[PDB]
C-alpha cells in the first residue's frame, strides 16, 4: 500500500537560515491551520520533518543543509507552495484492523 | 508509522507538455536505473505518479496540469532534482511494515 496523497498544501513565505541548521516557514491553509502544532511531523510532498515553530498561521520546519541536498527539499523556494500532510508518532486509534 | 524517506533522487532533464496531460522526465541515478520500469509508481518526494515512458536512464512520468496545481508537483523545474522512491501495486513478499 502507498499513496503519498497529500491532504493540503502550504505556502513558503519565509526562510530562517541558521549556520547550525536551516529552517523554512510556510503558510498553513484554513484546513491545516486547525489541528497542526509545533513538534508535529509535517511531510512536504511526503518528506517528513518536524515543526520548529509556528508563526501564527505560518509554520517553520527544520531542515539540515546537507539533508536538504540529500533529499529534494533544497528545491523549496519562498513564494512557492508545498504539498503538506500531517504525521504523528502515535495516536489513540492506532488499533489497525 | 510514516517516514516518507526516499531511497534515491532524480534529475529533471526534460519536460513533455501535452495539451491532454503534462509529462515530466528525470534522470535516474545508478541505483534507481536498475529495477525501475515504465508503468511503475514513482513517488517524487512522496507524490506517487506512474512512469509514462523511460528514455534510457531518463524516465518520463505523467502529471495532470490541474493535479500539478492541486499538488505541489508544479514546483518541479528541469535542471533540478527530485527525491524519487519506488512504489509497487503488489509484490511477492510485502511482509507489512
Ligand atoms: C520521522 C522522521 C523525521 C525526519 N525529519 C527530518 C527533518 O525535520 N529535517 C530533515 O532535514 N530531515 C528529516 N528526516 C530525514 C532523516 O531523519 C535523515 O535526515 C535522512 O535519512 C538522512 O540521514 C526525518 C526522517 C524521519 C524518519
Ligand atoms: C496510486 C496513485 C497514483 C497517482 N498517480 C498520479 C500521477 O501519475 N499523476 C498525477 O498528477 N497524480 C497522480 N495521483 C494523484 C491522484 O490520483 C489524484 O490526481 C489526486 O488525488 C487529485 O484527484 C495518484 C494517486 C494515487 C493514489
UniProtKB/Swiss-Prot annotation, chains A, B:
Per-repeat ranges for Lumazine-binding: 1-97
Source organism superkingdom: Bacteria
Residues that bind 2,4-dihydroxypteridine 2: 48-50, 62-67
Chain sites annotated for binding 2,4-dihydroxypteridine 1: 4-6
Function: Catalyzes the dismutation of two molecules of 6,7-dimethyl-8-ribityllumazine, resulting in the formation of riboflavin and 5-amino-6-(D-ribitylamino)uracil.
Subunit structure: Homotrimer. Unlike in B.subtilis, does not interact with 6,7-dimethyl-8-ribityllumazine synthase.
Protein name: Riboflavin synthase
